[PDB]
Amino acid sequence: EKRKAAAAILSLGNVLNYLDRYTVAGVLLDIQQHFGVKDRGAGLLQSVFICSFMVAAPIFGYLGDRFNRKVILSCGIFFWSAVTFSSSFIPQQYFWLLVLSRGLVGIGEASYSTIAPTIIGDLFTKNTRTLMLSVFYFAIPLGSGLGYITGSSVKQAAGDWHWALRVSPVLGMITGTLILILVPATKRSWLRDMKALIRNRSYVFSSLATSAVSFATGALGMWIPLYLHRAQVVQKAKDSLIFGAITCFTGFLGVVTGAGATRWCRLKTQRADPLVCAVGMLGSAIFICLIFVAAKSSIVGAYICIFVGETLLFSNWAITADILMYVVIPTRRATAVALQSFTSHLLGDAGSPYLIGFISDLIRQSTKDSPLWEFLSLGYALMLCPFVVVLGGMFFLATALFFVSDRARAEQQVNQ
Numbered sequence: 001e002k003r004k005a006a007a008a009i010l011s012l013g014n015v016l017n018y019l020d021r022y023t024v025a026g027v028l029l030d031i032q033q034h035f036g037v038k039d040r041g042a043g044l045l046q047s048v049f050i051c052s053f054m055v056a057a058p059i060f061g062y063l064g065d066r067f068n069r070k071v072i073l074s075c076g077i078f079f080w081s082a083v084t085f086s087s088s089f090i091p092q093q094y095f096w097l098l099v100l101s102r103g104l105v106g107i108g109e110a111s112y113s114t115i116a117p118t119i120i121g122d123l124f125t126k127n128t129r130t131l132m133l134s135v136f137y138f139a140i141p142l143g144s145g146l147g148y149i150t151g152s153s154v155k156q157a158a159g160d161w162h163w164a165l166r167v168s169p170v171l172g173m174i175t176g177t178l179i180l181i182l183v184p185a186t187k188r189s190w191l192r193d194m195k196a197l198i199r200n201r202s203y204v205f206s207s208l209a210t211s212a213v214s215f216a217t218g219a220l221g222m223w224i225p226l227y228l229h230r231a232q233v234v235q236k237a238k239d240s241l242i243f244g245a246i247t248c249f250t251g252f253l254g255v256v257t258g259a260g261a262t263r264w265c266r267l268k269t270q271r272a273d274p275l276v277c278a279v280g281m282l283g284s285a286i287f288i289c290l291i292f293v294a295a296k297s298s299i300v301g302a303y304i305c306i307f308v309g310e311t312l313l314f315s316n317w318a319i320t321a322d323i324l325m326y327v328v329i330p331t332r333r334a335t336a337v338a339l340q341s342f343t344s345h346l347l348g349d350a351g352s353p354y355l356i357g358f359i360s361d362l363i364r365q366s367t368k369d370s371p372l373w374e375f376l377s378l379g380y381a382l383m384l385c386p387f388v389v390v391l392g393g394m395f396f397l398a399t400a401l402f403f404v405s406d407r408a409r410a411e412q413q414v415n416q
């Protein structure tokens with residue numbers, strides 16, 4: 001029971017983690033208006049966070065292995081909660097202070113999101129650990145949707161964008177106390193692995209496909225609420241609320257759709273997983289293309305297109321994990337996962353928000369400023385993402401090309 005209590009507390013911690021991650025994304029319009037910065041700074045607010053998370057994830061993966069885990073995880077949670085609450089008090093004259101606070105929150109969330117799954121895995125046994133990790137990861141879309149809803153509801157209730165960053169820190173400290181109390185006390189080269197992995201074609205192409213998925217996910221999940229609000233302005237705070245509910249349902253249903261497609265395809269071929277990923281990505285790309293055309297005219301069609309595009313886009317998470325598990329022999333599933341996460345962050349979430357902001361800024365600078373042209377510039381900048389989704393689908397098909405050969409090679413090597 002105590003181990004189940006620890007798993008529940010860490011899952012609630014993950015919910016709070018993603019809520020903190022997307023609270024700013026919920027209320028980006030107010031930050032832009034108050035601080036006066038253009039779209040480039042708004043993109044920077046998440047590019048810096050993701051870069052810090054990128055750089056800090058391997059370090060905390062190493063420190064958890066070579067030091068205590070409960071203390072580090074709790075220090076991380078009282079670190080990012082305190083930093084979020086402090087950053088809520090930043091004056092208007094300072095913006096780089098807010099960006100730096102986003103970076104520090106990124107470091108803390110890196111520590112938590114890198115160490116907590118190891119604790120959850122160590123606590124339980126095979127089937128129990130599988131179920132508990134499934135819950136811990138189902139905490140993700142719920143966390144993101146609750147982050148959007150919390151941001152754009154504390155906005156409307158309190159009346160200041162500041163209070164959007166003030167409600168989550170208290171729960172952060174409380175969950176830190178519960179982690180530091182309820183969780184049972186924790187109990188216990190790369191060169192060759194990297195060369196073998198870069199020689200492994202299926203892993204390389206699946207990693208690039210995951211990078212494209214992360215690019216699309218970061219860029220859209222940040223800029224869609226603001227883009228929909230600009231759509232409402234041109235067409236003449238429910239946008240973020242409905243987007244949060246849509247994100248919750250799509251995160252919960254995309255894995256189910258992927259599992260169904262994998263089940264119905266595996267009876268007919270061995271490359272069911274990458275082919276299913278590729279078809280899902282192509283469908284998501286088409287519907288993400290249609291998001292902008294729909295939102296030009298009516299917003300209900302935009303919400304439906306978001307629903308379908310997220311459902312098809314979010315399906316390729318468990319399937320990507322399965323592909324990586326199959327192609328990579330057991331002795332390298334640690335280095336493979338670490339390098340895949342680093343590469344996905346490097347080519348996706350790290351650069352996508354700032355790149356979309358920069359392209360939007362250039363397009364807007366071309367023409368005289370107006371709300372209609374703000375709409376058009378943001379739409380054209382976000383139009384880059386469907387092309388990235390199509391490219392990722394191409395990379396998934398390239399993975400499918402070598403999937404059989406590399407699965408056979410992995411089985412041959414492990415059977416030795």
Ligand SMILES: CCCCCCCCCCCCC/C=C/[C@@H](O)[C@@H](N)COP(=O)(O)O
Pocket residue numbers: 133134135137138140141144216217218220221222224247251255306309310314317318321
């Ligand atoms: C229009 C696009 C907007 C993008 C929305 C931004 C919010 C990002 C939310 C990220 C959703 C990722 C969903 C991942 C699910 C899996 O990791 C687990 N639920 C299942 O893994 P398992 O248990 O099977 O191992």
